[PDB]
Design a protein around this nucleic acid. Structure first.
Ligand code: SF4
Ligand code: MG
Ligand code: MG
Ligand code: MG
Ligand code: MG
Ligand code: MG
Ligand code: MG
Ligand code: MG
Ligand code: MG
Ligand code: MG
Ligand code: MG
Ligand code: MG
Ligand code: MG
Ligand code: MG
Ligand code: MG
Ligand code: MG
Ligand code: MG
Ligand code: MG
Ligand code: MG
Ligand code: MG
Ligand code: MG
Ligand code: MG
Ligand code: MG
Ligand code: MG
Ligand code: MG
Ligand code: MG
Ligand code: MG
Ligand code: MG
Ligand code: MG
Ligand code: MG
Ligand code: MG
Ligand code: MG
Ligand code: MG
Ligand code: MG
Ligand code: MG
Ligand code: MG
Ligand code: MG
Ligand code: MG
Ligand code: MG
Ligand code: MG
Ligand code: MG
Ligand code: MG
Ligand code: MG
Ligand code: MG
Ligand code: MG
Ligand code: MG
Ligand code: MG
Ligand code: MG
Ligand code: MG
Ligand code: MG
Ligand code: MG
Ligand code: MG
Ligand code: MG
Ligand code: MG
Ligand code: MG
Ligand code: MG
Ligand code: MG
Ligand code: MG
Ligand code: MG
Ligand code: MG
Ligand code: MG
Ligand code: MG
Ligand code: MG
Ligand code: MG
Ligand code: MG
Ligand code: MG
Ligand code: MG
Ligand code: MG
Ligand code: MG
Ligand code: MG
Ligand code: MG
Ligand code: MG
Ligand code: MG
Ligand code: MG
Ligand code: MG
Ligand code: MG
Ligand code: MG
Ligand code: MG
Ligand code: MG
Ligand code: MG
Ligand code: MG
Ligand code: MG
Ligand code: MG
Ligand code: MG
Ligand code: MG
Ligand code: MG
Ligand code: MG
Ligand code: MG
Ligand code: MG
Ligand code: MG
Ligand code: MG
Ligand code: MG
Ligand code: MG
Ligand code: MG
Ligand code: MG
Ligand code: MG
Ligand code: MG
Ligand code: MG
Ligand code: MG
Ligand code: MG
Ligand code: MG
Ligand code: MG
Ligand code: MG
Ligand code: MG
Ligand code: MG
Ligand code: MG
Ligand code: MG
Ligand code: MG
Ligand code: MG
Ligand code: MG
Ligand code: MG
Ligand code: MG
Ligand code: MG
Ligand code: MG
Ligand code: MG
Ligand code: MG
Lengths: 122, 137, 96, 82, 208, 99
RNA sequence: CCGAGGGUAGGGCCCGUGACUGGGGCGAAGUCGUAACAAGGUAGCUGUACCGGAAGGUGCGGCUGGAU
RNA sequence: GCUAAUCCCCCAUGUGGACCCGCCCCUUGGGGUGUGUCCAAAGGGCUUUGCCCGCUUCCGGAUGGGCCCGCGUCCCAUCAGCUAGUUGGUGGGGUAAUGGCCCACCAAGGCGACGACGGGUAGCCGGUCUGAGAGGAUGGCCGGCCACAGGGGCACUGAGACACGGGCCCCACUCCUACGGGAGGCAGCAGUUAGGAAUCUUCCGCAAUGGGCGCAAGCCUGACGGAGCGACGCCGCUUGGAGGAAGAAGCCCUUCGGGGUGUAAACUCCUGAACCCGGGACGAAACCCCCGACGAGGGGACUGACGGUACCGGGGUAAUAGCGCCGGCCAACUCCGUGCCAGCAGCCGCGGUAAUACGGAGGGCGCGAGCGUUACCCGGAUUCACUGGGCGUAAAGGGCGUGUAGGCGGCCUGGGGCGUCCCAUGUGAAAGACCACGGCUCAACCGUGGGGGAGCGUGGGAUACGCUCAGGCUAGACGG
């Protein structure tokens, strides 16, 4: 545009839409599981991925992924959640943090234990 | 015609790009002082106040480098680059401390100060700023 | 549960009365001088206006009136009394 | 009242004062009117005290009141020596 | 803290002898003489063309591992040198060499910088008569690094100083042997320190 | 010092008060261009002697009314109904800007 | 007199929610046909209008970003 | 019902000050003078015809404020019209003082596309983070200003408050009670609870610095100086140093020859984090007292929470390592297990019986009392482009005129000097940032000194360019 148009209108600063609205500004949000079930993934992947619908303290109900091999989550399980989608489960925007509240860590895990919330084994 | 100063710089650019020996710009005292700088710094051979069908003009005599060898014989320009800085739609004025160095010294910035039209070196040697008219190399 | 603040309050109520009493009397005599001067009665107007002026400056002695406030009341008092008598004239006594 | 006193700067267990003039109602280390010296109670420098007496005597003139251990240090610089 | 594990694997990984042990670094049982290939299962397999990131990471890991310094302290020194007016490459090496634990090693009080650090950290060193047990101390020109006289009757420091008798130190140094004291002349140059390192490649690694 | 501004009187329909339109220029602080801006000052005319279209000077003054902090300093020029129309034409155009 | 507020009455804006309803996005492993891309088997697209289970068709006028 | 005073009041005195009116100077209510009128007070203690602490009136200073003005200060125009104390006038009231601040009357004004009004969000700045700069983001800690003190309203006292730990009232809530009635306000310091992903000791001392009161001694001070807990951040430090095999065992790989972990371990010598014992601060010398003179000056003394701490000396034990990652971007590869399953994933993508991509292992890479993850800000993003982008077919020319505001505008001369340029000068607090030096053994941290900037106020100067005013021209434009 001309310089006069810029004096008249300016340049538009565009805001960044959060990909984690349910957290409401927080790094984590506590919640309660409602549905604990498996969901199948989008093409071209095939699986039975473990998900929980979580009713949050931020006033939201959201689906969150349960990472690692095996879990112990059921209806009324109290979980903590963090940001992070599953490229491949549309709608899943968050992850349950293993080793917090009622989420058990992964049993027998050895590599990458801080994720998956597993204590060092003797 | 909204900007005779940029029209003249543009008359020169279109002319040098097709290696004409001279081109006529309609005359004015503020232009003479501008061409006065281009000749004294060697970007042009000079000029003379001529008259086209009864109207006062300026005939600007261009200079180029030596004929070149290879596929493209066209000689290198002496005025590689000339463009308007301050314009009717946006005036540009600098103080002496913020005058620029065109092309790391190898270029000239033409200014209009209240000591007349000067180069960036002349304006820095007189400690005055002004309107940054254009830049040449 | 207590304070020397209790002391400070009991004193503010005693000072409150002294301030209000003085300003009461000043107001009354000010308009009394003004009203007398309206029908002036110049000797009696200026007589009272002198008593209003004393109570004003006695107020501004302590923490009841400020200098400029006392000075302001005095000005408009004398300004009103003179320009009232001057509707009939002529001032017997002073000032001024 | 204007006062000449010691605004503590420095850091913990390392006090460094600026002998300073400010309104008495200021907080210790708040905006001061002007600085007229520094003070190092530990004496760990070739001049752990300094005083602009040309100014320190002016503030005493217009009625600044020095603190006790400020006057003690304004004395060691000779603002009182007649 | 500092690195503590095997130090020959460092040389073998960097493809260059880093003189990190003292006198076995000159024996024929130095690992570089016997196996001059990287450590681990695949050491003897044919290398692939390293990326420019690889090249620059390696040169930086060389210069670092040489001084046995943490990446944290290494990077702060580089950032100090980078602000400083003048050529950053020189100043970086200059600041590195100005570390007490490094000078103590240069003076031959210890065979290795590791040994120097356990010397300095144990107070067996003084600077201008002041006992200093800090490996990070920035020795300045005109200083004086002696052995703690209350340690001068110590086997290791004597045997070390014996082999330094008449031995040259860098131009930027001077060693009063027999008196167990040295002096920091000025901060050295790229010329004085021929390190098996193109330090310009370290400027480039940190500009990324 | 007391601020002094120049401008034209755009209304005088008030008792002892005239409205002085005052203009100023400055480079736009990001796009450089020189831009114009104007503002109206309620000016104390204690002699009702300044008239529509007069160019005057006003000087910052002890407050007179709610919006009056300037008295007229001196006349600068008279008969500038050309400037007064530019102000009026615009205000008239505002009716064509509604819904 | 003014006056916190309370009461009566009527407006304006915003948010949450609602039997039911409209279409949308995604899923993909289904049913129907095959509208577009080739002259895509009626050249295509288009504003509008009327119509048809659906893609879409037809009328009127326009474009070529249409093969031969 | 009694009584005291530095309590209140009355009278005198009037240096002086206050007000009215006149005159001079001045110029918004600044200074001066003339008549009249009006207004002062408080004593106490000593070493007692002299001191000190006080009290009264006035001028001045200094400091701290109030009020006013120019300029700057976020998102939505799917908020476009707003306004009756509204805008101005006169007169009054009110104040320390200007003002519709308040009131009465008079007039019909005031504001808005240069965004009024309305909706949303936000305490603002010094600075802070980022960035090549321009810019973007932010305002926690420290410093300055503002606002608030359960929600509201209000005034009183006072130099100053419409007062966090003062008063009155209304409301919401809570508690005590002898059931008649009463009380309360942690957004002070700790501490409890609730909420939350999440944020500390119901610690010590007034020794220092600072504040209030006091002639002084001194008293009070959750300001403060310190100690406590949290890897929350940065900085420093340790878990050892040297020697030590063509190279133990174990584990991994293997073409079964061998290769790897690996000088790594063991082992040898050497040093000696911790812990033990002895000594032990700086921070603190003023106020005070003596002489002098209660001054100048010189002497003398009391006093340390931290702390028996740092630190010094002597002794003295080899004395925690963990986390992420190894398809590509991106530095680090093999074996097994699994077989589109279980799983991984920031993007591209891995997995369907020989997976460097899943799970473990061996090995490797990267960091290290940390390492990762999640969230958010700036950068990479010249991807809102001022520096520094575009619109035939990629997203992008309004269907076409006409024209309002606005933006922009030909040749020559002169006047003014608005923009613009230069010089001087004031301001641009302190901290921070930056260069240097110095102090804690280094650093972090901190001290001392140095260099400026924009921006705005004032004074002086310049006139090419833009602007303005005046005169002239004909090349644009318009008419014949
Ligand atoms: S012995 Fe050789 S490989 Fe080992 S540390 Fe010394 S120089 Fe490096
Ligand atoms: Mg797949
Ligand atoms: Mg819940
Ligand atoms: Mg359960
Ligand atoms: Mg891991
Ligand atoms: Mg993984
Ligand atoms: Mg430009
Ligand atoms: Mg009391
Ligand atoms: Mg009465
Ligand atoms: Mg008084
Ligand atoms: Mg009062
Ligand atoms: Mg070497
Ligand atoms: Mg450099
Ligand atoms: Mg050498
Ligand atoms: Mg070397
Ligand atoms: Mg960089
Ligand atoms: Mg008025
Ligand atoms: Mg009401
Ligand atoms: Mg009501
Ligand atoms: Mg009520
Ligand atoms: Mg539905
Ligand atoms: Mg068809
Ligand atoms: Mg078909
Ligand atoms: Mg077809
Ligand atoms: Mg059709
Ligand atoms: Mg139908
Ligand atoms: Mg049908
Ligand atoms: Mg049909
Ligand atoms: Mg057709
Ligand atoms: Mg057509
Ligand atoms: Mg075609
Ligand atoms: Mg008297
Ligand atoms: Mg008035
Ligand atoms: Mg007041
Ligand atoms: Mg009002
Ligand atoms: Mg009225
Ligand atoms: Mg009316
Ligand atoms: Mg405006
Ligand atoms: Mg707008
Ligand atoms: Mg709000
Ligand atoms: Mg808010
Ligand atoms: Mg950039
Ligand atoms: Mg903010
Ligand atoms: Mg914050
Ligand atoms: Mg703050
Ligand atoms: Mg409130
Ligand atoms: Mg309140
Ligand atoms: Mg509360
Ligand atoms: Mg309340
Ligand atoms: Mg208040
Ligand atoms: Mg209070
Ligand atoms: Mg309180
Ligand atoms: Mg209160
Ligand atoms: Mg009770
Ligand atoms: Mg009780
Ligand atoms: Mg009872
Ligand atoms: Mg009661
Ligand atoms: Mg309580
Ligand atoms: Mg609290
Ligand atoms: Mg607490
Ligand atoms: Mg809690
Ligand atoms: Mg909770
Ligand atoms: Mg604390
Ligand atoms: Mg104290
Ligand atoms: Mg004290
Ligand atoms: Mg006292
Ligand atoms: Mg006592
Ligand atoms: Mg107390
Ligand atoms: Mg206490
Ligand atoms: Mg504290
Ligand atoms: Mg401590
Ligand atoms: Mg720590
Ligand atoms: Mg071997
Ligand atoms: Mg083996
Ligand atoms: Mg073997
Ligand atoms: Mg060893
Ligand atoms: Mg020993
Ligand atoms: Mg001491
Ligand atoms: Mg003395
Ligand atoms: Mg004491
Ligand atoms: Mg001891
Ligand atoms: Mg010892
Ligand atoms: Mg020993
Ligand atoms: Mg060992
Ligand atoms: Mg990693
Ligand atoms: Mg693959
Ligand atoms: Mg990387
Ligand atoms: Mg690689
Ligand atoms: Mg299986
Ligand atoms: Mg396969
Ligand atoms: Mg396999
Ligand atoms: Mg991977
Ligand atoms: Mg694997
Ligand atoms: Mg560390
Ligand atoms: Mg971290
Ligand atoms: Mg970004
Ligand atoms: Mg950008
Ligand atoms: Mg641009
Ligand atoms: Mg583009
Ligand atoms: Mg298109
Ligand atoms: Mg068109
Ligand atoms: Mg249209
Ligand atoms: Mg022009
Ligand atoms: Mg124009
Ligand atoms: Mg001129
Ligand atoms: Mg001119
Ligand atoms: Mg000018
Ligand atoms: Mg300046
Ligand atoms: Mg500063
Ligand atoms: Mg130092
Ligand atoms: Mg400084
Ligand atoms: Mg700068
Ligand atoms: Mg100027
Ligand atoms: Mg003309
Ligand atoms: Mg013509
Ligand atoms: Mg014609």
């Amino acid at each position: 545009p001309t310089i006069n148009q810029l004096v008249r209108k300016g340049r538009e600063k565009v805001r960044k839409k959060s990909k984690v609205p349910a957290l409401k500004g927080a790094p984590f949000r506590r919640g309660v599981c409602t549905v604990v079930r498996t969901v199948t993934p989008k093409k071209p992947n095939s699986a039975l991925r473990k998900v929980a619908k979580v009713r949050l303290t931020s006033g939201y109900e959201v689906t969150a992924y349960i990472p690692g091999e095996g879990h112990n989550l059921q209806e009324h399980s109290v979980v903590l959640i963090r940001g992070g989608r599953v490229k491949d489960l549309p709608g899943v925007r968050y992850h349950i943090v293993r080793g917090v509240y009622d989420a058990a860590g992964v049993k027998d895990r050895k590599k990458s234990r801080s994720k998956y919330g597993t204590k060092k084994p003797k | 015609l909204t900007d005779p100063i940029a029209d003249m710089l543009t008359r020169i650019r279109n002319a040098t790009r097709v290696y004409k020996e001279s081109t006529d710009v309609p005359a004015s005292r503020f232009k003479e002082e501008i061409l006065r700088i281009l000749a004294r710094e060697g970007f042009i051979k000079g000029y003379e106040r001529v008259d086209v069908d009864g109207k006062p003009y300026l005939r600007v005599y261009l200079k180029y480098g030596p004929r070149r060898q290879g596929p493209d014989p066209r000689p290198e320009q002496v005025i590689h680059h000339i463009r308007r800085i301050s314009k009717p739609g946006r005036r540009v004025y600098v103080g002496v401390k913020e005058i620029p160095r065109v092309r790391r010294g190898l270029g000239i910035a033409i200014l209009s100060t209240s000591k007349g039209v000067l180069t960036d070196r002349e304006a820095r040697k007189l400690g005055v700023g002004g309107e940054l008219i254009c830049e040449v190399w | 549960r207590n304070l020397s603040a209790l002391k400070r309050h009991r004193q503010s109520l005693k000072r409150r009365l002294r301030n209000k009493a003085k300003k009461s009397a000043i107001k009354t005599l000010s308009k009394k001088a003004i009203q007398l001067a309206q029908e002036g009665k110049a000797e009696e107007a200026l007589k009272i206006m002198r008593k209003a002026e004393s109570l004003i400056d006695k107020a501004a002695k302590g923490s009841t009136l400020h200098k400029n406030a006392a000075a302001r009341r005095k000005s408009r008092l004398m300004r009103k009394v003179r320009q009232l008598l001057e509707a009939a004239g002529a001032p017997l006594i002073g000032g001024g | 009242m204007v006062k000449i006193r010691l605004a503590r700067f420095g850091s913990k267990h390392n006090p460094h004062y600026r002998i300073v003039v400010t309104d008495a109602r200021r907080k210790r280390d708040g905006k001061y009117i002007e600085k007229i010296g520094y003070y190092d109670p530990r004496k760990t420098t070739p001049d752990w005290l300094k005083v602009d007496v040309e100014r320190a005597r002016y503030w005493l003139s217009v009625g600044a009141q020095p603190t006790d251990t400020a006057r003690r240090l304004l004395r060691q610089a000779g603002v009182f020596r007649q | 803290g500092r690195y503590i594990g095997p130090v020959c694997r460092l040389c073998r990984r960097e493809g260059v002898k880093l003189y990190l042990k003292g006198e076995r670094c000159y024996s024929p049982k130095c690992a570089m003489e016997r196996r001059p290939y990287p450590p681990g299962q695949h050491g003897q397999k044919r290398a692939r063309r390293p990326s420019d990131y690889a090249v620059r990471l390696r040169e930086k890991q060389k210069l670092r591992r040489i001084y046995g310094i943490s990446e944290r302290q290494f990077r702060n020194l580089f950032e100090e040198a980078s602000k400083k007016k003048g050529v950053t490459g020189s100043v970086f090496l200059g600041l590195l060499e100005s570390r007490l634990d490094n000078v103590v090693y240069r003076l031959g009080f210890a065979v290795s910088r590791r040994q120097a650090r356990q010397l300095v950290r144990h107070g067996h060193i003084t600077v201008n008569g002041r006992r200093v047990d800090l490996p990070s101390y920035r020795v300045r020109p005109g200083d004086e690094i002696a052995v703690a006289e209350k340690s001068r009757n110590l086997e290791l420091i004597r045997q070390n100083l014996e082999a330094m008798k008449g031995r040259k130190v860098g131009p930027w140094l001077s060693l009063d042997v027999e008196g167990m004291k040295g002096k920091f002349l000025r901060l050295p140059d790229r010329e004085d320190l021929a390190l098996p390192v193109n330090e310009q490649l370290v400027i480039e690694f940190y500009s990324r | 010092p007391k601020k002094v501004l120049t401008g034209v009187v755009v209304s005088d329909k008030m008792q002892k008060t005239v409205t002085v339109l005052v203009e100023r220029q400055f480079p736009h602080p990001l796009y450089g261009k020189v831009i114009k801006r104007s503002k109206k000052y309620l000016a104390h005319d204690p002699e009702e002697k300044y008239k529509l279209g007069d160019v005057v000077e006003i000087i910052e003054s002890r407050p007179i009314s709610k919006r009056k902090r300037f008295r007229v300093l001196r006349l600068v020029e008279s008969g500038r109904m050309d400037l007064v129309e530019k102000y009026l034409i615009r205000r008239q155009n505002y009716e064509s800007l509604s819904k």
